Design a protein around this ligand. Structure first.
Ligand code: FE2
Ligand code: FE2
Ligand code: FE2
Ligand code: FE2
Lengths: 214, 214
């Protein structure tokens, strides 16, 4: 079996949309107290995602790979509103005040998720770092689509600008996962084992993060 | 004394334009054999400069600082022709063939320069990493200006597109040094000592690199 296929199968078999939290989201069975906690607890990962990308770029000598990593990073962090600003719009539309979000101390659940990504993105296998990111970003497009639906037919999201982060990631992360899948191939150095090891680790780590809100 | 002033004084007092190699350039007293060797030996630093920036960014939690680091990185590596492509144009206009440049193995002089930057950019002081980069980029604008002159009135540079790298850096690195000087302030964490330690180290390291061609 080809390792990219093995890679996708791992994510297919531990995919956040099958997690209770997002199933609960799908049927609507989630409190406003639970959403505001997740929106706040996600913020640490959202601020850190640029560093995941620059961590790999900064250890990379493939000049064409770096430009691809830069393209993701540029979409993440460049301009107003970058993806960080978009999340904030979602966090504030949920009801959270700016002060409360900035004063929020992230759960150790969330710190473990981030730390799992950073471990791979700073590790010794550039393809494993991209696989860590890929095992998340490739789920994102379908997650966003179903998350807009749940914000509409369940949580009173009238204004579209209130879930713009998810509208952007419905499309942005189709490109990103395609570029990451290509980056994994161009950076492979007889380490497809770490690619899958990273995939297993990130996907489970994401389950523990979702577990935290129950 | 203020440490940014101390910082500039260090660079003023070990500035590449005062080095024999660039004085020799200034009077024209440099062989085509010497320029093609320097153009080739510089290539390792030129390919690595993006990683210097992403190395600091990837360790940084100041969200406004990261966007500044990204702006430099974007000017360095984004688009055709990025700064790497521009150097190539200079390397090829000097007479070097593409194959010979890609087949060139960099001197240990050059490997020491790069390694000095990367040590600081991956070290434990974000302001020292920016100071390592600043102690180089702040010299660049005046270096470029005098290096265009020496390519014109000495080395037969007719076509302007042949020294476009230096035309770009005459202006680009005015902005970059101003943004880096500002980044050093925003990232200082009671470590102005490392800022100057880095400055001393980078500036000397640059002298040893220039020393290599004599
Ligand atoms: Fe994103
Ligand atoms: Fe993304
Ligand atoms: Fe540059
Ligand atoms: Fe620059």
């Amino acid at each position: 079996m080809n390792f990219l296929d093995q890679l996708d199968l791992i994510i297919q078999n531990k995919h956040m949309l099958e997690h209770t939290f997002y199933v609960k989201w799908s049927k609507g069975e989630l409190t406003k107290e639970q959403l505001q906690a997740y929106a706040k607890d996600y913020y640490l990962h959202i601020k850190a995602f640029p560093k995941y990308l620059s961590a790999i770029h900064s250890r990379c000598d493939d000049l064409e790979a770096r430009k691809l990593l830069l393209d993701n990073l540029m979409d993440e962090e460049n301009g107003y509103p970058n993806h960080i600003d978009l999340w904030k719009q979602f966090v504030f539309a949920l009801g959270v005040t700016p002060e409360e979000l900035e004063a929020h101390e992230p759960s150790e659940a969330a710190k473990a998720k981030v730390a799992t990504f950073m471990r791979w993105c700073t590790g010794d296998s550039l393809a494993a770092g991209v696989a860590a990111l890929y095992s998340y970003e490739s789920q994102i497009p379908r997650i966003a689509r179903e998350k807009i639906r749940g914000l509409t037919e369940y949580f009173g999201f009238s204004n579209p600008e209130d879930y713009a982060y998810f509208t952007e990631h419905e499309e942005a992360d189709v490109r990103h996962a395609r570029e990451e899948k290509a980056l994994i191939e161009m950076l492979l150095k007889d380490d497809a084992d770490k690619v899958l090891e990273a995939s297993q680790e990130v996907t489970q780590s994401l389950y523990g993060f979702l577990d935290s809100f129950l």
